[PDB]
Amino acid sequence: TKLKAPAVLAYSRKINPTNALMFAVNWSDRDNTTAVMVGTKTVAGTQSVRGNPNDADKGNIQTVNFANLPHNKNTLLVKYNVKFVGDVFKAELGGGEYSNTLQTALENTDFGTLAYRYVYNIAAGRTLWRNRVGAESIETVITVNDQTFTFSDLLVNEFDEDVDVAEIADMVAGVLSGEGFVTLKVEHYMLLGEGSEVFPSQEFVENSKLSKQLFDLNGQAAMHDQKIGNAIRTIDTWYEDATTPIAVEPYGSVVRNGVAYRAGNKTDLFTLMDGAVNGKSLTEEDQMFVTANLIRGGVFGG
Amino acid sequence: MRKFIIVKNVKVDGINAKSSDITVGMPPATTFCGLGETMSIKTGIVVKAVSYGSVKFEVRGSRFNTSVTKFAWQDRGNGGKANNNSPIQPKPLADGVFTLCFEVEWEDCAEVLVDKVTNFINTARIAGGTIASFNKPFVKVAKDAEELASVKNAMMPCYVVVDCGVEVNIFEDAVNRKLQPMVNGYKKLEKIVDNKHMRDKFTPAYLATPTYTMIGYKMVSNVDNFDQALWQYGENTKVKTIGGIYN
Amino acid sequence: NAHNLISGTEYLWEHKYYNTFTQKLGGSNPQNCTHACNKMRGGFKQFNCTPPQVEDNY
DNA sequence: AGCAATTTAAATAGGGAAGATAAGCAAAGGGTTGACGAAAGCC
DNA sequence: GGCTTTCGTCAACCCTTTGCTTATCTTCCCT
C-alpha cells in the first residue's frame, strides 16, 4: 500500500535569477554604470602538478580570461533579477495524485523563514561568490515592486533578524505559499578597491586554448544564473551535524567537498517525500527542506 | 568516323525502378538500348549504341524499402471489391535526371537530326517515366579518339555505366568486389505458343529470365575509353559495351 | 528467377550486404502468392541499384 | 599639370598544468493494400 | 453452359539503418 513516486515526477525552478551582469561604478556615483569587459591574458609560471616533480621547473604558459575593475572605479556592481514564482507544488511533469498528496502533506511548511533565508542570501551577498572576499562594505539594493531596500552589513553564515529581509520575505513567502510571482531587482555594490580584480562565473570549455574562460555577455563580465540560484538556495542548515548552510539538493550534495551531506543517513529528499506521501509526519525543518527542493526543482522519479 | 547526339539533363520522373526481381534502382542498359531502338523505329535514325549517365537519381522510398504505388482497380470483373483498396503488386518508382548520348549515323544537317530526336523525346518515356524536362540535344562527332573524348566529356556531369563482368555469380561479387548488378540482357527459357494475348501475333515470343552483368559507376570524364560506356545490342540476346569489360 | 530471390536473400543476410531493398511480395498475406513468400514473410532482398548522385554545388 | 628613388635585414628559446563529474524517467500505435476455390443465382 | 457475384480457404518474419563515385585547365611558336 506504499505510494510509490511516479517515474515522470518533475518540478520546475521557481526561483529564477537572470545572468548577473557585472559593471564598474564608484562608491559615490553609482549611476555612472560602466561595464566590466572580460579580457584575455596569457601568463607564464611553473607547472606544479602533484605527481610531477620533473616538469616542475620546465615552465607553464596558460591563457586565462580575466576581469578586473578599471583603475578609476573602486566598486563592483552586480545587476540581476530574482524571480520567485508561486504555484510551488504543481509539478509540471509530475502525476496529479502524487503531487497532490505531496501538496497536502506539505501545506504547513513554514514559508516565512524559507523566504527569509532566500532574501537573506540575496541581501547578505551570497550571490557574490568570490566577489565578496576583500571588501570594505557590500551594499545590496533590492527593488521589490516599487519598494527599494538597502543592505549594508549582514554576516552570510547565520541568518540574523532584521526588518527589511523580513519585509521582502513577506511577499516572497506570500508568492511561494500561493499563486503569482515577485521580481527582485538586485544591485550589489562591493567596494572592492581601485583596479581590483573581479570574479565572474567561468564556463566549461573542453577543447579550448583558454585555461580559464569566463562567462561574457556581449563581452561584459557576468555570472551564470545557475550560480546565482545556487547562492539563493544555499539555506540548508537542517541536515545531520550541520555547521554551515549548504545548497538545497535532493541528496544534500556538494561537488567540491566531495561529500553528500544527506546521502546514507535517511535524510535525503526522496525518503522524506515517500514518508510524506505515506503518512510519516515530517518535521518543520524536514518539510522546509523538501519544499526548498520543490522550488529548486528537479525530476524525482524512477 | 563516329557521330553522336547528346541530350543533357533529361529530368524523368515516374521511372519504373523495378529493373528485375533482384534489382531495383537505376534502369539497366536494356532499357536505354530499347529507347535507342524505339527511335530507330519512330524517327528512322538507326542507332548503334547509347551511352547513358545519371546526373540525379532517387528511388522513391526509404533507405531499405521502396515506396509502393497505390494501385487502381483497373481489372475487369472485380467490381464490388472496388470500394476497398486495390492490392499492390511490387513496382518501385523513381525519379532521375539522365544524360543520354546516342551513336547515330546521319546524312542530313544537324538541325533536322536535333529536331527528330527532340520530337522523339517529347513522345518518349524513359523506363516507364514521363520525361519532365530535357535540354536541347546537340550533335557532336568523333572523327578520331581525341574527338571521341570530346563527345565523352560533353556529357558532363553524369555517372555512366561501365561493364565489369561476372566472375562467379552476382551475389558473391556484389559483396566481395562491391560492384553494382544490372540487367545486361535476358535468357530465353521456353517458346511461347499463345500469341493471342500479346502486342504482336507474328513477332516470336519467349519467356525470359534476366541475365545480369556486374557494373560500376564512373564519371564520364574519368572513363578512359568512351567505348566502355556505350551500350549496344549484342548478338547473344543481351546488351554489351563496345569497349568490353572495364578494367 | 526464384533461386536469385531465395539464395540472394539468404546470402545477403548472411554476408551482411546492406546496400539493398526489402520487399514482401505477396502483400498482406503472401500464401496466395508463393511458398517462399508464404514462409519468408520478412521480405526478399533485392539490390539497391541507385547510382551515385552529382552534387549540384561544384 | 605630372613628378614621390634605390638595397638591407625583420630573433634565437622555454613553457603551454592536471582532477572531478557528463542523470535518472516514459512514450515510440494501428487503420487499407487476397488470389484461387467453392457455392450459387443469372443470362 | 458458361458466368458473374459473394463467401469461405489458407496462412504466419530474423533482422540491416550509407557510400555506390568523388567534374571536362597551357608547354613551344610567330604572327
3-state secondary structure A252-295: CEECCCCEECCCCCCCCHHHHHHHHCCCCCCCHHHHHHHHHHHH
Q: Do C47 and B59 touch (CB under 8 A)?
A: no
**Chain C residues whose beta carbon lies within 8 Å of the beta carbon of residue B159:** 51-52, 54
Grid coordinates representing A286? 524536514
- In whole angstroms, give the CA distance from residue B98 to residue B111: 22
- Contact residues for A122 (Cβ-Cβ < 8 A; gap 6+): A82, A140, A142, A184, A186, A232
With a 7 Å cutoff on the CB, does B81 touch strand E? yes
**H or E stretch covering C45:** strand C44-49
- In whole angstroms, give the CA distance from residue A234 to residue A244: 9
Integer Rg of chain B from CA: 19
- Technique behind the model: cryo-EM
Is C57 in the B-facing interface, judged by CB distances under 8 Å?
no
Under DSSP, the state recorded for C25 is: S
| A184 CB-contact burial (10 Å; exposed 0-12 / middle 13-18 / buried 19+) | buried
- In whole angstroms, give the CA distance from residue A179 to residue A161: 27
Tell me which residues from 55 to 74 on chain A have a beta carbon below 7 angstroms from nucleic acid strand D.
Answer: 55, 58-64
Give the Cα-Cα-Cα angle A34, A40, A43 (nearest 5 degrees). 130
- Residue appearing with cell numbers 505515506: A278
What is each CA distance from C54 to B23, B63, B126, B158, in whole angstroms? Answer: 22, 18, 19, 7
- In whole angstroms, give the CA distance from residue C5 to residue B171: 10
- Taking a C-beta distance cutoff of 8 angstroms, is the pair A225, A19 a contact? yes
**Chain B residues whose beta carbon lies within 8 Å of the beta carbon of residue C7:** 171
Among positive and negative, which fits the CA dihedral A162, A163, A167, A168? Answer: negative
- Residue appearing with cell numbers 547473344: B236
- In whole angstroms, give the CA distance from residue A110 to residue A100: 18
Q: CB-hemisphere CA count at 13 Å for B27?
A: 30
- In whole angstroms, give the CA distance from residue A159 to residue A68: 31
The three-state secondary structure class of C41 is coil
> What is the distance in angstroms between the CA of the first residue and the CA of the last residue of chain A?
18
CB atoms near residue A50 (< 10 Å)? 5
- Residue appearing with cell numbers 519468408: C40
Q: How many interchain CB pairs under 8 A, B with C?
A: 97
Å separating the CA of residue C23 from the C1' of nucleotide E12: 17
The pair phi, psi for residue A215, each rounded to 5°, is -80, 125
- Residue appearing with cell numbers 494475348: B197
Q: Do B64 and C47 touch (CB under 8 A)?
A: no
- Please name every residue paired with C48 in a beta bridge, in sequence order, or none if there are none: B24
**H or E stretch covering C46:** strand C44-49
Q: Do C1 and B22 touch (CB under 8 A)?
A: yes
- In whole angstroms, give the CA distance from residue A199 to residue A111: 32
**A111-123 vs A284-296: helix axis angle to the nearest 10?**
60
Å separating the CA of residue C25 from the C1' of nucleotide E9: 20
The closest alpha carbon to A71, from A43, A34, A20, belongs to: A34
With a 7 Å cutoff on the CB, does B88 touch strand D? yes
- In whole angstroms, give the CA distance from residue C54 to residue A97: 59
Resolution (A): 2.9
- Taking a C-beta distance cutoff of 8 angstroms, is the pair A200, A67 a contact? yes
Q: Which residue is nearest to nucleotide D26 (CA to C1')?
A: A8
- Residue appearing with cell numbers 570524364: B221
- Taking a C-beta distance cutoff of 8 angstroms, is the pair A184, A148 a contact? no
CB atoms near residue C58 (< 10 Å)? 5
Under DSSP, the state recorded for C44 is: E
Is B119 in the C-facing interface, judged by CB distances under 8 Å?
no
CB within 8 Å of chain B, chain C residues 3-32: 4-5, 7-8, 11-12, 15-17, 20-23, 25, 27
The closest alpha carbon to A234, from A89, A79, A127, belongs to: A127
Is B181 in the C-facing interface, judged by CB distances under 8 Å?
yes
The dihedral formed by the CA atoms of B56, B59, B62 and B67, expressed in degrees to the nearest 10? 150
The pair phi, psi for residue A30, each rounded to 5°, is -70, -15
Tell me which residues from 1 to 58 on chain C have a beta carbon below 7 angstroms from nucleic acid strand E.
Answer: 9, 13, 18-22, 29, 31-32, 38-43, 45, 48, 50-55, 58
Å separating the CA of residue A13 from the C1' of nucleotide D27: 24
Q: At B131, which amino acid appears?
A: I
The dihedral formed by the CA atoms of B228, B233, B238 and B240, expressed in degrees to the nearest 10? -10
CB atoms near residue A231 (< 10 Å)? 23
- In whole angstroms, give the CA distance from residue A272 to residue B169: 71
- In whole angstroms, give the CA distance from residue B172 to residue B170: 6
Length of chain C: 58
The closest alpha carbon to A175, from A199, A155, A145, A220, belongs to: A145
Grid coordinates representing B230? 556505350
Phi-psi region of B38 (alpha: psi -120 to 50; beta: other; left: phi over 0): alpha
The pairing of beta strand B2-16 with beta strand A259-260: unpaired
CB atoms near residue A210 (< 10 Å)? 15
- In whole angstroms, give the CA distance from residue A61 to residue A135: 31
What is each CA distance from B84 to A98, A270, B81, B87, B109, in whole angstroms? Answer: 49, 56, 6, 9, 56
**A269-276 vs A284-296: helix axis angle to the nearest 10?**
110
- In whole angstroms, give the CA distance from residue B228 to residue B245: 7
- In whole angstroms, give the CA distance from residue B134 to residue B119: 12
CB atoms near residue C19 (< 10 Å)? 16
What is each CA distance from A179 to A86, A107, B53, in whole angstroms? Answer: 5, 14, 69
The dihedral formed by the CA atoms of A286, A287, A288 and A289, expressed in degrees to the nearest 10? 50
- In whole angstroms, give the CA distance from residue A23 to residue C2: 80
Grid coordinates representing A115? 523566504
Which residue from B65, B175, B210 is facing C22, i.e. has the nearest CB?
Answer: B65
Q: At B59, which amino acid appears?
A: V
With a 7 Å cutoff on the CB, does A43 touch strand D? no
- In whole angstroms, give the CA distance from residue B114 to residue A223: 73
Query: For residue C45, how far is the Cα from the chain centroid?
Result: 2
Query: For residue B6, how far is the Cα from the chain centroid?
Result: 15
If you write DSSP's letter for every residue of chain B in order, what string do you get? -EEEEEEEEEEEEEEE-B-SSSEEES--HHHHHHHHHHHHHHT---EEEEEEEEEEEEESB-SSSB--------SSS-TTSSSSPPP-----EEEEEEEEEEEE---S-HHHHHHHHHHHHTT-EETTEEEEE-PPPEEEEESSHHHHHHHHHTT-S-EEEEE---SS-HHHHHHHT--EEEEEEEEEEEE----TTSS-SSS--EEEEEEEEEEEEEETTT-S-GGGT-EEEETTTEEEESS-S--
- Residue appearing with cell numbers 526548498: A292
Give the Cα-Cα-Cα angle A224, A127, A137 (nearest 5 degrees). 135
Q: Which residue of C has its CA nearest to B182?
A: C49
The pair phi, psi for residue A250, each rounded to 5°, is -60, -25
A264-272 — which CB contacts under 8 Å span 24+ positions?
A265/A239, A265/A240, A267/A239, A267/A240, A269/A293, A269/A300, A270/A5, A270/A300
B107: distance to nearest CA of chain C, Å? 35
Chains meeting B at 3+ CB pairs closer than 8 A? C
Under DSSP, the state recorded for C39 is: H
- Residue appearing with cell numbers 550533335: B139
Q: At A300, which amino acid appears?
A: F
Grid coordinates representing A145? 515592486
What is each CA distance from B13 to A160, B63, B94, B132, in whole angstroms? Answer: 80, 19, 6, 6
- Taking a C-beta distance cutoff of 8 angstroms, is the pair C21, B65 a contact? yes
- In whole angstroms, give the CA distance from residue A181 to residue A14: 9
Å separating the CA of residue B22 from the C1' of nucleotide E15: 19
Suggest the residue from B171, B184, B189 to mutate for an interface test with chain C (most C CBs closer than 10 A).
Answer: B171
- Taking a C-beta distance cutoff of 8 angstroms, is the pair A273, A300 a contact? yes
Å separating the CA of residue C32 from the C1' of nucleotide E9: 10
- In whole angstroms, give the CA distance from residue A211 to residue A231: 25
- In whole angstroms, give the CA distance from residue A236 to residue A246: 5
Q: SS3 letters for chain A?
A: CCCCCCCCCEECCCECCCCEEEEEECCCCCCCCEECECEEEEEEECCCCCCCCCCCCCCEEEEEEEEECCCCCCEEEEEEEEEEECCCCCCCCCCHHHHHHHHCCCCCCCHHHHHHHHHHHHHCCCCCCCCCCCCCCEEEEEEECCCEEEECCCCCCCCCCCHHHHHHHHHHHHHHHCCCEEEEEEEEEEECCCCCEECCCEECCCCCCEEEEECEECCEEEECHHHHHHHHCCCECCCCCCCCCECCCCCCEECCCCEECCCCCCCCHHHHHHHHCCCCCCCHHHHHHHHHHHHHCEECCC
Strand D: positions under 7 A of a protein C-beta atom: 14-22, 24-26, 32-36
Under DSSP, the state recorded for C43 is: -
- Please name every residue paired with C13 in a beta bridge, in sequence order, or none if there are none: none
- In whole angstroms, give the CA distance from residue B90 to residue A176: 64
Under DSSP, the state recorded for C54 is: P
- In whole angstroms, give the CA distance from residue A134 to residue B107: 100
What is each CA distance from B169 to B181, B209, B211, in whole angstroms? Answer: 10, 15, 10
Grid coordinates representing B65? 524499402
What is each CA distance from C11 to A212, A288, C7, C42, in whole angstroms? Answer: 57, 67, 6, 15
- Please name every residue paired with B234 in a beta bridge, in sequence order, or none if there are none: B238
